[PDB]
Amino acid sequence: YTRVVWCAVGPEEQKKCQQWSQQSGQNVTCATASTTDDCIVLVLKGEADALNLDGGYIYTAGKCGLVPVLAENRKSSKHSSLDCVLRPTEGYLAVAVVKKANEGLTWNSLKDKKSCHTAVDRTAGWNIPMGLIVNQTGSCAFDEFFSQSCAPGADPKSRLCALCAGDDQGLDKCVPNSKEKYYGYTGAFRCLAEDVGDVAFVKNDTVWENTNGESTADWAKNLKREDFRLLCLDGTRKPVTEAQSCHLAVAPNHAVVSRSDRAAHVEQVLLHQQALFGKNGKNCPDKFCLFKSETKNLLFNDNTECLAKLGGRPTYEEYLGTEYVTAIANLKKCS
Template sequence: MQPIVAEKYAATAGDDGMNYYSVAVVRRNSIYGSGAGTGTQLGNGLLGSNACFPGIGTAAGWLYPISVMLQNGDIKVTECNAVVKAVTDFFHNMCLPGALTSFYNPFGNNPTEICQLCKGTSGTKCSTKDPSAGYDGAFRCLQNGDGDVAFLRHDTLIHLTNNASSEFVLLCPNGGTRDIQDYKNCNYGSIPANTIMTSALQDVKTRAAYKQFLLQASEWFGVGKPYVSLFNMFSSDAWLGYGGQRNLLFTDTTQELVDVGDRDTYYKWVDAKFYDNVEKLNQCPLNYAKWCVISGGEKSKCENMMMAFGAKDLKPKLDCVLGKSADHCMQLIADGDADMMTLDSGDVYLAGEKYGLKPIAAEDYGNMEASFYVVAAAWKRNPTMTLFNLKDKRACMAGMGRGDGWIVPVSIFIETEQFVPQYCSIFENIGQLFIRTCIPGALDSEYNPNQYPISLCEGCAAGGYKKCQRNQIEQYYGATGAFRCLVENGGDVAFVRHLTVRDNTDARNHAIWARNRRSDDYELMCKDGTRKPIDEWRTCHLGKLPSNAVVTGKHKSEEDVNIYWQLLNYGQQFFSSDTLHIEVFDVFYGEERFEKVPALLKKLSLKYNEIQLKIEHTYLQANTFTH
């Protein structure tokens, strides 16, 4: 949007009247209006009072006064992205029209006190149509005795009191009170005048025509102009019968419209103070939340997430830190150089044991338990293969150390006596069991110091240095990658998650490799040697594991953890979808950051921790004979 003309509130020449002031108004005979000269601070004096606001988001009635009170420390911020709750903790009852809309109340949990003083009924209460909405409505809220203070424009107050009322006074931010005419010495800031805007997509000629039309109308129907008796552009008196609202189309105190000149963008029109107040209104105890990623794909997706969060002005600001590996990211978080990352359940256990990291949020796939099942998927056309005759077959596994791609499968190999780990390492056992595998990360010295046998990576798809890397550079990494390995005939069996097959077939995944894949071409291999359709994973799975989780450092305080969780929760509220079989929370979900299934993040519960504890025995069993 682009401003073309602006309201002017004084008939004099020059820049006089090109702004208005934010003021706090109280009744002179109240305890708030009788403190002239006492030095009583605004914030301290108004604690526990009833407040009338014209509407959330208004400059004079919300942005400027609340920003000042936040800066002065009168209003304490305990939860980022929730300034309404902080304001509610300071005042008693309020009328704050618009505060229940989804933008300002995404979780539907704003306190009821924010609408206690509003006079609307049914669908109008606490909305922009409420009788107490707008600057005139907020003044009525004060005038009728419902509120102790009203936050207004200075000219609205003067207009409604005919510039002569001694009943009201201004309450100054630096202490004391002043008469309503002394607004230049008792205000919360000077605000640029309102503008009429149009789409920046309109061509120059069209915008010029709009501008000329409005300026000519102002010359004919403005205050003191030739045809004002026929129609007064800047008065709402004739329409007060329609709900009593003023400032219809234009502010009633406007004298004329003027050309904005070269200040024809929003950023040129508002001043630095305005931006500063916006920042103050969204202040957060933490400035940044640094997310650690381990590949170029992850970094790109993280940057998209960062821009999406920034567009909603979510705090703390998200930043992306590129680590060399999952283990390196764990180290960065432990050292305080990064704050969060997403890990598979196997890595969550390792991160806790090795670096003391703690999970703070987990994916939930609809079972309300933040868990998933590991399954063995195979082509239906190979019906004789079971979990008991895997010798000389080819295997696709999600990744070294992962719960779905290593811990559970290796435990199953031992349980079904595919090999007995005595004299050889697990890697050699698997190399002897399968003729070829793809286990991303299996030849990393971090996991396999001997880097042998090479057959553990021969089934992987990437070339050169990218081959078998334990990140998205390797096409067959992760549960989706392991299934792709099976689909592209890189293996005979894929160890994946219970939803992986369903989510990558029947047109649910639009990637080229997944097109025209039918779910009924695949079956699950069960622990008893039988095979079942892919949707019978509840009775044909290899084990249950905790879902992917977001982890942070053990040194983080409870306040920090809550701030991180709120950032993620607001993010998924703005960028998620409740429609199944759609890639929800698209900024996050996908193998790059979160598992590519219909999922939401949940704050960790005791149930998750109970499941996480059960992984310890399985993890140790799968790694006892690694070396």
């Protein structure tokens, strides 16, 4: 009797999760919460077993005792002869993106501009950029760096939320789930694409996946990569093809966390589940694809190839890396 309860963040993930439950013969069922932290709470109470998390949340969950089970592994180059589930994850590139036409905008002139973040507490969208900015400005008043922003999870009436648009009925403004138009990698990038913001803190892959026809969504179908630039830390601006030499940091892959006593089962289930609905899963695209959601990245990132076994039975600190963990610890000393 090993039934796994997943935690969906927001009505859209709940929707996708219920389809997954249905297709899984209920070997996976769904619990739902409004925020990722709520989801972490539910798992602590055991009202839920697991969920996929950005490194920044892995940190919250980890302090609460939850452990990494499997990590997101997207398309790779080296190590590729090895099975995706046995391959070492290579982390992703956190980057700062802006419109090319917004000439003279560099890392060194971000003050009092408009920013777009995936969400408060996330790795590329917040921990890395805010950590860097707090450090470089020698000030903890990061809610006063940019003139306005959309940083889901912040006070809805604060300027950190001024650019957020809420759902299609204008409700839920700045919630840290996908109902907020500018939430996550995609929402933040869109916030920049529509010029609501001057800079978006997302990862390298997001710029590629929503440009040059990679996304047919209405706001993105017509975006061109040439019209965007990455802000390197040395003050220069580079084409989005140079992320390898123009990024804020390399971030650990999003990963699944669960309680310890549920970790083995949750692992067994997911290894089986992705065999069915994973990339070449026996039932995707036929019945259900676990790693697709019309680019909204629900439950898992849309570019995930598989969930990979972790080498060394890593604690959340070993998974995230002492460096990142310290960077977070340091940034959190601010609020």
